[PDB]
Amino acid sequence: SNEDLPVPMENPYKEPLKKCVLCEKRVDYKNVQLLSQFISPFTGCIYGRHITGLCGKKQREITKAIKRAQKMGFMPVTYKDPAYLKDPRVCNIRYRE
């Protein structure tokens, strides 16, 4: 009929979905340096997923690892260890104005 008619196919130009910072990375309770990047420096409170930027799965993984680390004598509870204050910033939170 017509050679120029469009051909059914999956979108070639499809854009890959957006991954979180921890996508496909092991989250362990002993890696307190990674865990400390998602708590508050002053209170030690876990940040929500609107701050950490994580997905549901990794948000739950970090939460379960911080609590296990805190309960097994690896991580503090009421603050962030001063030795990890220098690590990079991944969380969308600015205490200073």
Binding site: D4, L5, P6, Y13
Partner: protein
């Protein structure tokens, strides 16, 4: 006579592929204060702001360079059964095209 299906396949707009982060040439057809209305060959025009450098050069008929983002700005909002369109395109004016 060429068929419509052939025309669409070989059309410059069909060749562009996705219009995000593409480079295109536009023409200024309407100016309102420091807002330039630029036709880049699509359905909807874009509207950019006159650059501080060489502001006087951007007059009507002047061909410029653009970085497309969307061909039409549209978005569905809560409680809407159809998309809300502002009947405008999104592009970033980069500067005048060298006549050469």
């Amino acid at each position: 006579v060429e068929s419509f299906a052939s025309m669409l396949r070989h059309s410059p707009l069909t060749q562009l592929g996705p219009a995000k982060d593409k480079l295109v040439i536009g023409r200024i057809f309407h100016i309102v204060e420091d807002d330039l209305y630029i036709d880049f060959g699509g359905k909807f025009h874009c509207v950019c702001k006159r650059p501080d450098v060489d502001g006087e050069k951007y007059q009507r008929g002047t061909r410029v360079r653009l970085r497309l983002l969307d061909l039409e700005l549209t978005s569905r909002f809560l409680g809407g059964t159809t998309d809300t369109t502002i009947l405008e395109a999104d592009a970033v004016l980069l500067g005048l095209q060298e006549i050469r």
